[PDB]
Protein backbone atom coordinates (compact mmCIF):
# COMPACT_ATOMS: atom_id res chain seq x y z
CA UNK A 1 0.00 0.00 0.00
CA UNK A 2 3.02 2.26 0.47
CA UNK A 3 4.30 3.56 -2.90
CA UNK A 4 6.48 0.47 -3.31
CA UNK A 5 5.37 0.03 -6.94
CA UNK A 6 7.24 3.21 -7.91
CA UNK A 7 10.58 1.66 -6.94
CA UNK A 8 9.77 -1.45 -8.99
CA UNK A 9 8.84 0.73 -11.97
CA UNK A 10 12.12 2.63 -11.64
CA UNK A 11 14.14 -0.59 -11.45
CA UNK A 12 12.29 -1.94 -14.50
CA UNK A 13 13.25 1.25 -16.34
CA UNK A 14 16.84 0.77 -15.17
CA UNK A 15 16.85 -2.81 -16.47
CA UNK A 16 15.46 -1.60 -19.81
CA UNK A 17 18.21 1.03 -20.03
CA UNK A 18 20.83 -1.61 -19.21
CA UNK A 19 19.41 -3.78 -22.00
CA UNK A 20 19.56 -0.82 -24.40
CA UNK A 21 23.23 0.03 -23.74
CA UNK A 22 24.39 -3.56 -24.34
CA UNK A 23 26.59 -3.76 -27.43
CA UNK A 24 26.48 -7.13 -29.23
CA UNK A 25 29.81 -8.39 -30.54
CA UNK A 26 30.64 -11.02 -33.16
CA UNK A 27 32.21 -14.39 -32.39
CA UNK A 28 32.04 -14.26 -28.57
CA UNK A 29 33.76 -10.90 -28.14
CA UNK A 30 33.14 -8.46 -25.30
CA UNK A 31 34.19 -5.14 -23.81
CA UNK A 32 34.35 -3.70 -20.29
CA UNK A 33 30.79 -2.36 -20.35
CA UNK A 34 29.25 -5.69 -21.39
CA UNK A 35 31.06 -7.45 -18.54
CA UNK A 36 29.87 -4.74 -16.17
CA UNK A 37 26.27 -5.13 -17.30
CA UNK A 38 26.42 -8.91 -16.85
CA UNK A 39 27.28 -8.44 -13.17
CA UNK A 40 24.57 -5.78 -12.83
CA UNK A 41 22.07 -8.29 -14.25
CA UNK A 42 22.18 -10.20 -10.95
CA UNK A 43 21.15 -7.07 -9.01
CA UNK A 44 17.90 -6.83 -10.98
CA UNK A 45 17.31 -10.58 -10.63
CA UNK A 46 17.65 -10.45 -6.84
CA UNK A 47 15.26 -7.50 -6.56
CA UNK A 48 12.67 -9.15 -8.80
CA UNK B 1 57.16 -0.28 -54.11
CA UNK B 2 60.16 -1.10 -56.32
CA UNK B 3 63.01 -3.04 -54.68
CA UNK B 4 65.61 -0.38 -55.53
CA UNK B 5 63.47 2.42 -54.10
CA UNK B 6 62.79 0.45 -50.91
CA UNK B 7 66.49 -0.38 -50.56
CA UNK B 8 67.56 3.23 -51.02
CA UNK B 9 64.77 4.74 -48.92
CA UNK B 10 65.51 3.19 -45.52
CA UNK B 11 67.67 0.72 -43.57
CA UNK B 12 67.09 -3.02 -43.02
CA UNK B 13 64.26 -3.86 -40.65
CA UNK B 14 63.43 -6.34 -37.90
CA UNK B 15 59.68 -6.31 -38.45
CA UNK B 16 57.09 -8.18 -36.39
CA UNK B 17 53.57 -8.07 -37.81
CA UNK B 18 50.99 -8.37 -35.03
CA UNK B 19 47.50 -9.38 -36.19
CA UNK B 20 44.30 -9.10 -34.17
CA UNK B 21 42.11 -12.18 -34.59
CA UNK B 22 39.51 -11.49 -31.90
CA UNK B 23 35.81 -11.81 -32.65
CA UNK B 24 35.22 -8.16 -33.50
CA UNK B 25 37.45 -8.32 -36.60
CA UNK B 26 35.17 -10.93 -38.16
CA UNK B 27 33.86 -10.03 -41.59
CA UNK B 28 35.17 -7.48 -44.08
CA UNK B 29 37.95 -6.21 -41.82
CA UNK B 30 39.54 -9.66 -41.48
CA UNK B 31 39.78 -10.07 -45.26
CA UNK B 32 41.16 -6.54 -45.54
CA UNK B 33 43.70 -7.34 -42.81
CA UNK B 34 44.84 -10.46 -44.67
CA UNK B 35 45.28 -8.54 -47.92
CA UNK B 36 47.12 -5.73 -46.11
CA UNK B 37 49.48 -8.19 -44.39
CA UNK B 38 50.29 -9.80 -47.74
CA UNK B 39 50.89 -6.39 -49.32
CA UNK B 40 53.22 -5.28 -46.52
CA UNK B 41 55.08 -8.59 -46.71
CA UNK B 42 55.62 -7.77 -50.38
CA UNK B 43 57.57 -4.65 -49.29
CA UNK B 44 60.35 -6.63 -47.57
CA UNK B 45 63.67 -7.80 -49.01
CA UNK B 46 66.35 -10.35 -48.14
CA UNK B 47 68.08 -7.93 -45.74
CA UNK B 48 64.96 -7.63 -43.56
CA UNK B 49 63.77 -10.12 -40.94
CA UNK B 50 60.08 -10.68 -40.29
CA UNK B 51 57.66 -12.82 -38.29
CA UNK B 52 53.86 -12.74 -38.07
CA UNK B 53 51.98 -13.28 -34.81
CA UNK B 54 48.29 -13.25 -33.91
CA UNK B 55 46.51 -12.64 -30.62
CA UNK B 56 42.97 -13.23 -29.34
CA UNK B 57 43.12 -13.46 -25.53
CA UNK B 58 46.35 -15.41 -26.24
CA UNK B 59 49.29 -14.67 -28.55
CA UNK B 60 50.84 -17.22 -30.88
CA UNK B 61 52.70 -17.54 -34.17
CA UNK B 62 50.73 -18.07 -37.38
CA UNK B 63 53.20 -20.52 -38.97
CA UNK B 64 55.96 -23.01 -38.10
CA UNK B 65 58.68 -20.34 -37.78
CA UNK B 66 58.52 -19.22 -34.09
CA UNK B 67 61.13 -16.47 -34.63
CA UNK B 68 62.36 -13.94 -37.18
CA UNK B 69 63.31 -15.32 -40.60
CA UNK B 70 65.30 -13.91 -43.50
CA UNK B 71 62.13 -12.89 -45.40
CA UNK B 72 63.21 -14.31 -48.75
CA UNK B 73 60.80 -15.65 -51.38
CA UNK B 74 60.18 -19.01 -49.69
CA UNK B 75 59.73 -17.65 -46.16
CA UNK B 76 57.44 -14.88 -47.39
CA UNK B 77 55.39 -17.45 -49.31
CA UNK B 78 55.05 -19.54 -46.14
CA UNK B 79 54.03 -16.48 -44.12
CA UNK B 80 51.44 -15.44 -46.72
CA UNK B 81 49.97 -18.95 -46.84
CA UNK B 82 49.75 -19.03 -43.04
CA UNK B 83 48.21 -15.55 -42.90
CA UNK B 84 45.49 -16.36 -45.42
CA UNK B 85 44.09 -19.00 -43.07
CA UNK B 86 43.28 -17.09 -39.86
CA UNK B 87 39.82 -16.91 -38.30
CA UNK B 88 38.29 -14.33 -35.97
CA UNK B 89 37.29 -15.78 -32.60
CA UNK B 90 37.61 -14.69 -28.97
CA UNK B 91 38.31 -11.56 -26.91
CA UNK B 92 41.02 -9.00 -27.63
CA UNK B 93 44.01 -8.76 -25.29
CA UNK B 94 46.60 -6.17 -26.31
CA UNK B 95 48.90 -6.76 -23.32
CA UNK B 96 49.58 -10.41 -24.17
C1 LIG C 1 44.14 -25.20 -39.45
C2 LIG C 1 44.99 -25.70 -40.58
O1 LIG C 1 45.16 -26.90 -40.79
N1 LIG C 1 45.55 -24.76 -41.35
C3 LIG C 1 46.40 -25.07 -42.48
C4 LIG C 1 47.33 -23.90 -42.78
O2 LIG C 1 48.18 -23.67 -41.67
C5 LIG C 1 48.17 -24.19 -44.02
O3 LIG C 1 48.93 -23.04 -44.38
C6 LIG C 1 47.27 -24.58 -45.19
C7 LIG C 1 48.04 -25.01 -46.42
O4 LIG C 1 48.15 -23.95 -47.36
O5 LIG C 1 46.43 -25.69 -44.82
C8 LIG C 1 45.57 -25.41 -43.72
CA1 LIG D 1 37.93 -6.96 -30.43
UniProtKB/Swiss-Prot annotation, chain A:
Subcellular location per the Swiss-Prot or TrEMBL entry: Cell membrane, Sarcolemma, T-tubule
Extracellular side: 22-36
Glycosylated residues in this chain: 30
TM stretches of this protein: 3-21
Protein modification: Phosphorylated. Phosphorylation by PKA activates the calcium channel. Both the minor and major forms are phosphorylated in vitro by PKA.
Domain of life: Eukaryota
Tissue specificity remark: Detected in skeletal muscle T-tubules (at protein level).
Function: Pore-forming, alpha-1S subunit of the voltage-gated calcium channel that gives rise to L-type calcium currents in skeletal muscle. Calcium channels containing the alpha-1S subunit play an important role in excitation-contraction coupling in skeletal muscle via their interaction with RYR1, which triggers Ca(2+) release from the sarcplasmic reticulum and ultimately results in muscle contraction. Long-lasting (L-type) calcium channels belong to the 'high-voltage activated' (HVA) group.
Domain-level remarks: Each of the four internal repeats contains five hydrophobic transmembrane segments (S1, S2, S3, S5, S6) and one positively charged transmembrane segment (S4). S4 segments probably represent the voltage-sensor and are characterized by a series of positively charged amino acids at every third position. The loop between repeats II and III interacts with the ryanodine receptor, and is therefore important for calcium release from the endoplasmic reticulum necessary for muscle contraction.
Subunit composition and interactions: Component of a calcium channel complex consisting of a pore-forming alpha subunit (CACNA1S) and the ancillary subunits CACNB1 or CACNB2, CACNG1 and CACNA2D1. The channel complex contains alpha, beta, gamma and delta subunits in a 1:1:1:1 ratio, i.e. it contains either CACNB1 or CACNB2. CACNA1S channel activity is modulated by the auxiliary subunits (CACNB1 or CACNB2, CACNG1 and CACNA2D1). Interacts with DYSF and JSRP1. Interacts with RYR1. Interacts with STAC, STAC2 and STAC3 (via their SH3 domains). Interaction with STAC3 promotes expression at the cell membrane.
Family note: Belongs to the calcium channel alpha-1 subunit (TC 1.A.1.11) family. CACNA1S subfamily.
Name of the protein in its database record: Voltage-dependent L-type calcium channel subunit alpha-1S
Species the sequence originates in: Oryctolagus cuniculus (Rabbit)
Gene giving rise to this polypeptide: CACNA1S
Residue span relative to the full protein: 50 to 97 of 1873
From Swiss-Prot, chain B:
PTM remark: Proteolytically processed into subunits alpha-2-1 and delta-1 that are disulfide-linked.
Glycosylation-annotated residues: 85
Tissue and organ distribution: Skeletal muscle.
Motif, MIDAS-like motif: chain positions: 20-24
Compartments it resides in: Membrane; Cell membrane
Residues that coordinate or bind a divalent metal cation: 20, 22, 24
Note: Binds gabapentin, an antiepileptic drug.
Entry text on domains: The MIDAS-like motif in the VWFA domain binds divalent metal cations and is required to promote trafficking of the alpha-1 (CACNA1) subunit to the plasma membrane by an integrin-like switch.
UniProt subunit comment: Dimer formed of alpha-2-1 and delta-1 chains; disulfide-linked. Voltage-dependent calcium channels are multisubunit complexes, consisting of alpha-1 (CACNA1), alpha-2 (CACNA2D), beta (CACNB) and delta (CACNA2D) subunits in a 1:1:1:1 ratio.
Function: The alpha-2/delta subunit of voltage-dependent calcium channels regulates calcium current density and activation/inactivation kinetics of the calcium channel. Plays an important role in excitation-contraction coupling.
Family: Belongs to the calcium channel subunit alpha-2/delta family.
Protein name from the UniProt record: Voltage-dependent calcium channel subunit alpha-2/delta-1
Gene for this chain: CACNA2D1
Part of the full-length chain shown: 242 to 337 of 1106
Amino acid sequence: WKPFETIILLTIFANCVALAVYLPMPEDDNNSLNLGLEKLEYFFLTVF
Amino acid sequence: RRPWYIQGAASPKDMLILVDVSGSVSGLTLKLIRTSVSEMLETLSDDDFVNVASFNSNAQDVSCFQHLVQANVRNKKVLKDAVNNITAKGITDYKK
